[PDB]
Amino acid sequence: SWEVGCGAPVPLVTCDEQSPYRTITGDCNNRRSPALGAANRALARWLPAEYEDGLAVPFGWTQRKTRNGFRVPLAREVSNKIVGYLDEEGVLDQNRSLLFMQWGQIVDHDLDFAPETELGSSEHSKVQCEEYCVQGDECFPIMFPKNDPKLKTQGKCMPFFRAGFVCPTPPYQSLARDQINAVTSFLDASLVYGSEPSLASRLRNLSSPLGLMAVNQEAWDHGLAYPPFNNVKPSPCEFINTTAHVPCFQAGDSRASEQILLATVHTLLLREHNRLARELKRLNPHWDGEMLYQEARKILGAFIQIITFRDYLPIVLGSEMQKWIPPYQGYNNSVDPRISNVFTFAFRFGHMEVPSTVSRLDENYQPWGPEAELPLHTLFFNTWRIIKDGGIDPLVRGLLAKNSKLMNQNKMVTSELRNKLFQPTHKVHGFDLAAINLQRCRDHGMPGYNSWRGFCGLSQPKTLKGLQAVLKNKVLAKKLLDLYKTPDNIDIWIGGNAEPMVERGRVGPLLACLLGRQFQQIRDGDRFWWENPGVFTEKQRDSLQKVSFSRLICDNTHITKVPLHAFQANNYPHDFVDCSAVDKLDLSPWASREN
Numbered sequence: 001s002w003e004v005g006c007g008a009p010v011p012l013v014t015c016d017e018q019s020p021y022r023t024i025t026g027d028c029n030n031r032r033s034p035a036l037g038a039a040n041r042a043l044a045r046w047l048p049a050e051y052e053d054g055l056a057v058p059f060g061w062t063q064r065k066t067r068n069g070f071r072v073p074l075a076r077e078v079s080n081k082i083v084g085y086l087d088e089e090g091v092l093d094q095n096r097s098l099l100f101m102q103w104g105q106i107v108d109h110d111l112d113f114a115p116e117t118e119l120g121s122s123e124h125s126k127v128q129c130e131e132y133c134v135q136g137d138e139c140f141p142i143m144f145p146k147n148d149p150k151l152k153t154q155g156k157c158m159p160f161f162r163a164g165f166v167c168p169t170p171p172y173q174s175l176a177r178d179q180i181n182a183v184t185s186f187l188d189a190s191l192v193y194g195s196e197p198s199l200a201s202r203l204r205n206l207s208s209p210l211g212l213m214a215v216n217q218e219a220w221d222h223g224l225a226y227p228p229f230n231n232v233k234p235s236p237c238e239f240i241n242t243t244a245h246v247p248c249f250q251a252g253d254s255r256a257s258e259q260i261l262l263a264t265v266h267t268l269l270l271r272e273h274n275r276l277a278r279e280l281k282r283l284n285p286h287w288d289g290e291m292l293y294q295e296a297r298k299i300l301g302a303f304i305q306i307i308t309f310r311d312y313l314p315i316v317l318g319s320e321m322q323k324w325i326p327p328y329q330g331y332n333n334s335v336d337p338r339i340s341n342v343f344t345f346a347f348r349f350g351h352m353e354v355p356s357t358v359s360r361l362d363e364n365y366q367p368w369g370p371e372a373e374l375p376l377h378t379l380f381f382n383t384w385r386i387i388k389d390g391g392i393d394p395l396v397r398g399l400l401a402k403n404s405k406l407m408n409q410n411k412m413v414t415s416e417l418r419n420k421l422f423q424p425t426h427k428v429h430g431f432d433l434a435a436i437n438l439q440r441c442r443d444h445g446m447p448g449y450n451s452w453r454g455f456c457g458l459s460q461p462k463t464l465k466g467l468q469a470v471l472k473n474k475v476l477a478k479k480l481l482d483l484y485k486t487p488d489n490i491d492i493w494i495g496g497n498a499e500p501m502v503e504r505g506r507v508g509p510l511l512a513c514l515l516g517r518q519f520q521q522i523r524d525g526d527r528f529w530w531e532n533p534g535v536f537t538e539k540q541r542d543s544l545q546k547v548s549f550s551r552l553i554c555d556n557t558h559i560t561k562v563p564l565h566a567f568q569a570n571n572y573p574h575d576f577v578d579c580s581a582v583d584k585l586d587l588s589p590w591a592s593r594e595n
């Protein structure tokens, strides 16, 4: 019941109230509460935050302190004992394509972003965290336990920086720490267009009144486009190969070049915008640049919503889909569309879906060259392999023909992410995504595994047998209690992902609830949802129902053979058909006439 109008977002965005378009920042979606779902604001809390001192200090910070009478185990040790494996044999998903993983990162990047605070103009602190492993202020290092192979090569810890929080983004006082979400909570294609009016303008091609997005002028892809280079130095993408001099791509989301395949889909979406705009120019010659931009932006936003809710989510949630996300009944403005803090860790279920290699396939879907199959760790912040080694076509073919990694309780996260992660600030391929996630759970003030179990209306195990029944695994349950000593202290990330998957889905009971509650809210609480009457005309909606990710590939690449259902495991040549068998997006109903 204290400071409720706090924060430090964009000082000026007034509502048009009659505009048929979304705001870049995400304001004016809810008319009663204008800033609901907007960017640069605190993540929603579904349960009260849990800190060591109940305000901002994470569990694990102080040696002498306990959580419920027990020490919290080092994140890297939880990683070493539970999360890791060596044998990549027989871990693939027999009915999920690599796109299934890839679309998850796209949707995620559209919904949430808690940025780290590493910021001072020039700093002694960046050094103080990395070189000397000194815990203090925003520095919260991930220590190596005894007998870690990384003691011998990497030092005593992995540098880790606490995420930004609201109100004085600089320092602190009362209530609990709330972390910022730097993107719009709506599934509104923020990753293509930006969440700031500043950035959203720089990505646009304002040189001509054609409503196009800016493209790369130095490099091309068989006559097709790339996002422009991000020319801020130092560049993580230039670092990995100083000979190539190929920088990171510049999109609406700042993580767009984190991996080769993420940059691949960012390029497809950027291409689709221009393809839509040039089509809308033909049909409507009198339309100015702004309408061409906005109208295309609106179509692509719906595209991402249709693909997510029709094609992706049912195969994630499975039998739980209908329980949490019932048929659409119209816009409910009493629904909180805000992304919760816990969703940002719930969605991280996909880090266990990431395989150890990325393939490049040719026009006959066979290996493309002597170096066709590459280790994932060589592909973090790698733009040079796109631009200087064959374009995005052999990469897109790989997404369709290769499999995702299946979750296993014995084989959780691949070493390519668990030992050899690259991060943009630093220089080694030696970070641990699993250890980072668990440290981030604590940084963000997450309640334990049982608090969420209670929140989702599920049983709360207290004993080994109770946990053995839930996890349906004696070893995993024993290994978790050996570290956590109680099911109350188990970090949400590791707890949720250890549960056996629901029927026809890829997350367990707890995650299905957490994910299911959120996706429902962002859909029900969005005024510009594609099915909401008045957002699109009836004829427009009949066009948008026939879109597919297959069609996206057909219109925007020189790939000619695609599967009809791209999110499932397909084999060449049987499951693949010519692009002419795939329904096109008809833009006829967008043609407007004067009289």
Ligand code: HEM
Pocket (backbone or CB within 6 Å): 101, 102, 103, 104, 105, 106, 108, 112, 113, 114, 115, 258, 259, 343, 344, 345, 347, 348, 349, 350, 351, 354, 380, 436, 437, 440
């Ligand atoms: C190789 C591909 C990927 C790489 C290299 C990668 C890397 C990362 C990194 C470094 C972070 C920051 C973690 C933190 O500081 O808390 C992150 C966050 C996250 N990742 Fe990924 N990721 C990948 C794919 C995916 C996929 C496929 C999904 C889902 C299907 C996903 C879901 C998430 C979510 C929800 C967050 C937190 C977003 C936020 O709220 O800030 N990631 N990822």
Ligand SMILES: *[C@@H]1O[C@H](CO)[C@@H](O[C@@H]2O[C@H](CO)[C@@H](O[C@@H]3O[C@H](CO)[C@@H](O)[C@H](O)[C@@H]3O)[C@H](O)[C@H]2NC(C)=O)[C@H](O)[C@H]1NC(C)=O
Pocket (backbone or CB within 6 Å): 205, 207, 208, 210, 212, 213, 214, 215, 216
């Ligand atoms: C913003 O939009 C303008 C106008 O659409 C872009 O300018 C155009 O850029 C294209 C592609 O580089 C040029 O077309 C080229 O045509 C020549 C001759 O046909 C051909 O040899 C090239 O291979 C290529 O197809 C064209 O010169 C140019 N047109 C105009 C009106 O100047 C511009 O690239 C966009 N700017 C950004 C930053 O995205």
Ligand SMILES: *[C@@H]1O[C@H](CO)[C@@H](O[C@@H]2O[C@H](CO)[C@@H](O)[C@H](O)[C@H]2NC(C)=O)[C@H](O)[C@H]1NC(C)=O
Pocket (backbone or CB within 6 Å): 095, 314, 315, 504, 568, 569
């Ligand atoms: C792979 O899994 C998908 C996902 O369930 C299966 O696709 C289903 O196909 C049936 C028709 O046989 C439809 O009624 C379902 O709606 C589909 N599921 C969804 C929600 O997409 C498919 O059966 C599996 N494919 C193979 C070859 O095993």
Ligand SMILES: *[C@@H]1O[C@H](CO)[C@@H](O[C@@H]2O[C@H](CO)[C@@H](O)[C@H](O)[C@H]2NC(C)=O)[C@H](O)[C@H]1NC(C)=O
Pocket (backbone or CB within 6 Å): 241, 243, 244, 384, 388
């Ligand atoms: C750094 O990038 C360059 C590309 O700029 C890579 O070198 C190319 O590799 C292929 C295959 O050997 C050759 O066809 C090109 O001629 C090479 N380019 C030049 C001019 O060197 C190189 O492999 C990358 N290096 C590392 C270590 O990743």
Ligand SMILES: *[C@@H]1O[C@H](CO)[C@@H](O)[C@H](O)[C@H]1NC(C)=O
Pocket (backbone or CB within 6 Å): 332, 333, 334, 335
């Ligand atoms: C809107 O959502 C709220 C909160 O979940 C719910 O109580 C209410 O029944 C919904 N309103 C309508 C009319 O659907």
Ligand SMILES: [Ca+2]
Pocket (backbone or CB within 6 Å): 110, 111, 183, 184, 185, 186, 187, 188, 189, 190, 191
């Ligand atoms: Ca968004």
